[PDB]
Design an enzyme around this catalytic site. Structure first.
Site, PDB file in Angstrom:
ATOM      1  N   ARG A 110     -22.622 -11.043  -0.590  1.00 59.34           N
ATOM      2  CA  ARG A 110     -22.441 -11.381   0.822  1.00 59.34           C
ATOM      3  C   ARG A 110     -23.642 -10.937   1.651  1.00 59.34           C
ATOM      4  O   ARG A 110     -23.929  -9.745   1.743  1.00 59.34           O
ATOM      5  CB  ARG A 110     -21.163 -10.760   1.400  1.00 59.34           C
ATOM      6  CG  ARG A 110     -20.933 -11.122   2.878  1.00 59.34           C
ATOM      7  CD  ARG A 110     -19.815 -10.307   3.516  1.00 59.34           C
ATOM      8  NE  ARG A 110     -18.501 -10.925   3.344  1.00 59.34           N
ATOM      9  CZ  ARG A 110     -17.395 -10.260   3.013  1.00 59.34           C
ATOM     10  NH1 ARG A 110     -17.439  -8.945   2.819  1.00 59.34           N
ATOM     11  NH2 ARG A 110     -16.243 -10.915   2.882  1.00 59.34           N
ATOM     12  N   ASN A 117     -15.880  -1.208   1.882  1.00 61.29           N
ATOM     13  CA  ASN A 117     -14.533  -0.789   1.502  1.00 61.29           C
ATOM     14  C   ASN A 117     -13.447  -1.797   1.862  1.00 61.29           C
ATOM     15  O   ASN A 117     -13.707  -2.809   2.528  1.00 61.29           O
ATOM     16  CB  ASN A 117     -14.199   0.599   2.062  1.00 61.29           C
ATOM     17  CG  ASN A 117     -14.092   0.616   3.585  1.00 61.29           C
ATOM     18  OD1 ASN A 117     -13.484  -0.271   4.191  1.00 61.29           O
ATOM     19  ND2 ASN A 117     -14.690   1.634   4.211  1.00 61.29           N
ATOM     20  N   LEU A 146     -19.140   0.190  12.848  1.00 56.60           N
ATOM     21  CA  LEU A 146     -18.721   0.631  11.518  1.00 56.60           C
ATOM     22  C   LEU A 146     -18.669   2.158  11.405  1.00 56.60           C
ATOM     23  O   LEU A 146     -18.230   2.694  10.382  1.00 56.60           O
ATOM     24  CB  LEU A 146     -19.627   0.047  10.426  1.00 56.60           C
ATOM     25  CG  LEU A 146     -19.687  -1.483  10.369  1.00 56.60           C
ATOM     26  CD1 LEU A 146     -20.573  -1.949   9.227  1.00 56.60           C
ATOM     27  CD2 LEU A 146     -18.281  -2.089  10.260  1.00 56.60           C
ATOM     28  N   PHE A 158     -27.104  -8.814  10.433  1.00 57.00           N
ATOM     29  CA  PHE A 158     -25.994  -7.905  10.192  1.00 57.00           C
ATOM     30  C   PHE A 158     -26.335  -7.025   8.979  1.00 57.00           C
ATOM     31  O   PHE A 158     -26.782  -5.882   9.155  1.00 57.00           O
ATOM     32  CB  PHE A 158     -24.680  -8.699  10.038  1.00 57.00           C
ATOM     33  CG  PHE A 158     -23.436  -7.849   9.825  1.00 57.00           C
ATOM     34  CD1 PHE A 158     -23.450  -6.472  10.003  1.00 57.00           C
ATOM     35  CD2 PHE A 158     -22.236  -8.456   9.447  1.00 57.00           C
ATOM     36  CE1 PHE A 158     -22.299  -5.714   9.794  1.00 57.00           C
ATOM     37  CE2 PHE A 158     -21.078  -7.707   9.240  1.00 57.00           C
ATOM     38  CZ  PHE A 158     -21.105  -6.338   9.410  1.00 57.00           C
ATOM     39  N   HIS A 165     -16.908   3.225   7.692  1.00 57.18           N
ATOM     40  CA  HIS A 165     -17.686   3.112   6.466  1.00 57.18           C
ATOM     41  C   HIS A 165     -18.564   4.344   6.304  1.00 57.18           C
ATOM     42  O   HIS A 165     -19.184   4.804   7.271  1.00 57.18           O
ATOM     43  CB  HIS A 165     -18.539   1.838   6.486  1.00 57.18           C
ATOM     44  CG  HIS A 165     -17.731   0.577   6.455  1.00 57.18           C
ATOM     45  ND1 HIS A 165     -17.486  -0.122   5.292  1.00 57.18           N
ATOM     46  CD2 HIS A 165     -17.101  -0.104   7.445  1.00 57.18           C
ATOM     47  CE1 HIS A 165     -16.744  -1.181   5.564  1.00 57.18           C
ATOM     48  NE2 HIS A 165     -16.494  -1.192   6.862  1.00 57.18           N
ATOM     49  N   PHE A 173     -23.707  -1.721   1.200  1.00 49.20           N
ATOM     50  CA  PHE A 173     -24.511  -2.622   2.011  1.00 49.20           C
ATOM     51  C   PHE A 173     -25.712  -1.933   2.659  1.00 49.20           C
ATOM     52  O   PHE A 173     -25.749  -0.709   2.816  1.00 49.20           O
ATOM     53  CB  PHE A 173     -23.659  -3.386   3.040  1.00 49.20           C
ATOM     54  CG  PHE A 173     -22.966  -2.513   4.060  1.00 49.20           C
ATOM     55  CD1 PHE A 173     -21.770  -1.881   3.752  1.00 49.20           C
ATOM     56  CD2 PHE A 173     -23.483  -2.370   5.343  1.00 49.20           C
ATOM     57  CE1 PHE A 173     -21.117  -1.106   4.687  1.00 49.20           C
ATOM     58  CE2 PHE A 173     -22.837  -1.592   6.289  1.00 49.20           C
ATOM     59  CZ  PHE A 173     -21.655  -0.955   5.963  1.00 49.20           C
ATOM     60  N   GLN A 189     -24.820  -7.226   1.353  1.00 46.05           N
ATOM     61  CA  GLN A 189     -23.805  -6.514   0.581  1.00 46.05           C
ATOM     62  C   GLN A 189     -23.917  -6.801  -0.922  1.00 46.05           C
ATOM     63  O   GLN A 189     -24.129  -7.947  -1.328  1.00 46.05           O
ATOM     64  CB  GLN A 189     -22.421  -6.910   1.097  1.00 46.05           C
ATOM     65  CG  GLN A 189     -21.272  -6.074   0.559  1.00 46.05           C
ATOM     66  CD  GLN A 189     -19.945  -6.467   1.156  1.00 46.05           C
ATOM     67  OE1 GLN A 189     -19.881  -7.066   2.233  1.00 46.05           O
ATOM     68  NE2 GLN A 189     -18.872  -6.142   0.457  1.00 46.05           N
TER      69      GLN A 189
HETATM   70  N1  LIG Z   1     -14.040  -1.090  -3.502  1.00 46.68           N
HETATM   71  C1  LIG Z   1     -14.047  -2.232  -2.812  1.00 46.68           C
HETATM   72  C2  LIG Z   1     -14.865  -2.354  -1.698  1.00 46.68           C
HETATM   73  C3  LIG Z   1     -14.879  -3.539  -0.969  1.00 46.68           C
HETATM   74  C4  LIG Z   1     -14.079  -4.611  -1.350  1.00 46.68           C
HETATM   75  C5  LIG Z   1     -14.110  -5.796  -0.593  1.00 46.68           C
HETATM   76  N2  LIG Z   1     -14.154  -5.426   0.824  1.00 46.68           N
HETATM   77  C6  LIG Z   1     -15.106  -5.816   1.698  1.00 46.68           C
HETATM   78  O1  LIG Z   1     -16.015  -6.583   1.377  1.00 46.68           O
HETATM   79  N3  LIG Z   1     -14.967  -5.365   2.964  1.00 46.68           N
HETATM   80  C7  LIG Z   1     -15.900  -5.683   4.057  1.00 46.68           C
HETATM   81  C8  LIG Z   1     -16.999  -4.617   4.080  1.00 46.68           C
HETATM   82  O2  LIG Z   1     -16.872  -3.587   3.423  1.00 46.68           O
HETATM   83  N4  LIG Z   1     -18.118  -4.950   4.758  1.00 46.68           N
HETATM   84  C9  LIG Z   1     -19.366  -4.204   4.832  1.00 46.68           C
HETATM   85  C10 LIG Z   1     -20.100  -4.619   6.121  1.00 46.68           C
HETATM   86  C11 LIG Z   1     -20.074  -5.999   5.602  1.00 46.68           C
HETATM   87  C12 LIG Z   1     -18.474  -6.191   5.501  1.00 46.68           C
HETATM   88  C13 LIG Z   1     -17.861  -6.065   6.792  1.00 46.68           C
HETATM   89  C14 LIG Z   1     -17.305  -4.903   7.346  1.00 46.68           C
HETATM   90  C15 LIG Z   1     -16.739  -4.892   8.616  1.00 46.68           C
HETATM   91  C16 LIG Z   1     -16.688  -6.062   9.363  1.00 46.68           C
HETATM   92  C17 LIG Z   1     -17.204  -7.242   8.834  1.00 46.68           C
HETATM   93  C18 LIG Z   1     -17.135  -8.414   9.589  1.00 46.68           C
HETATM   94  C19 LIG Z   1     -17.641  -9.615   9.100  1.00 46.68           C
HETATM   95  C20 LIG Z   1     -18.211  -9.634   7.833  1.00 46.68           C
HETATM   96  C21 LIG Z   1     -18.278  -8.460   7.079  1.00 46.68           C
HETATM   97  C22 LIG Z   1     -17.778  -7.245   7.566  1.00 46.68           C
HETATM   98  C23 LIG Z   1     -13.252  -4.485  -2.464  1.00 46.68           C
HETATM   99  C24 LIG Z   1     -13.238  -3.299  -3.195  1.00 46.68           C
END
Ligand SMILES: Nc1ccc(CNC(=O)NCC(=O)N2CCC[C@@H]2c2cccc3ccccc23)cc1
Length: 164
Positions: A54, A101, A121, A59, A125, A112, A62
């Site tokens: 991703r 997470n 965040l 931004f 995070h 990321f 990931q």
């Molecule tokens: N151990 C584990 C960790 C993550 C996952 C899947 N979860 C995610 O991808 N969560 C989103 C996340 O952690 N992030 C990092 C910043 C990028 C994304 C994110 C976090 C917070 C808001 C976001 C809004 C739009 C797009 C992405 C967002 C599954 C298992």
């Protein structure tokens, strides 16, 4: 001192170069130790061969799902998930290294690198490092992202390890 690790990254079969990261073991030793060992691969598994799945311009980028290779997976050296160590370090600007997470206390291996300040965040995070060298590489990766996060090139961590 704090560990320095590296990721060598391809885009569509050609090398972009190397991202060097400092891991802030002085603030978050457990989170840093996890990323360190996954970079060396010394536990029998880790980041080598996995992808940036991703990437969103202005931004972050990931990566780190080496189990399911689709953003739903990954695992830590401790077990499948481990707690949020603390929220002491903040998402201050581009180059910040932070744990992805699925809510509180679900750190695995996904991480990321921010390309902007992502203050919303903070407290959600765990920040555990930053880019020492190779932000140009991070920008290339970012340029292959999209609004939805889908990448327009196949972005692979071909090699990774510990420098110091
Ligand atoms: N151990 C584990 C960790 C993550 C996952 C899947 N979860 C995610 O991808 N969560 C989103 C996340 O952690 N992030 C990092 C910043 C990028 C994304 C994110 C976090 C917070 C808001 C976001 C809004 C739009 C797009 C992405 C967002 C599954 C298992």
């Amino acid at each position: 001192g704090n560990p320095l690790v590296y990721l060598d990254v391809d885009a569509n079969g050609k090398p972009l170069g190397r991202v060097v990261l400092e891991l802030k073991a002085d603030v978050v030793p457990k989170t840093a130790e996890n990323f360190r060992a996954l970079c060396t691969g010394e536990k029998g598994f880790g980041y080598k061969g996995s992808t940036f799945h991703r990437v969103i311009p202005s931004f972050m980028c990931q990566a780190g799902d080496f189990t399911n290779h689709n953003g739903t997976g990954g695992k830590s050296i401790y077990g499948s998930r481990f707690p949020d160590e603390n929220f002491t370090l903040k998402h201050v600007g581009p180059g910040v290294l932070s744990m992805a997470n699925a809510g509180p206390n679900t750190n695995g291996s996904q991480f990321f690198i921010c390309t902007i300040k992502t203050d919303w965040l903070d407290g959600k995070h765990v920040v555990f490092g930053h880019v020492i060298e190779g932000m140009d590489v991070v920008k290339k990766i970012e340029s292959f992202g999209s609004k939805s996060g889908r990448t327009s090139k196949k972005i692979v961590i071909t090699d990774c390890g510990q420098l110091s």
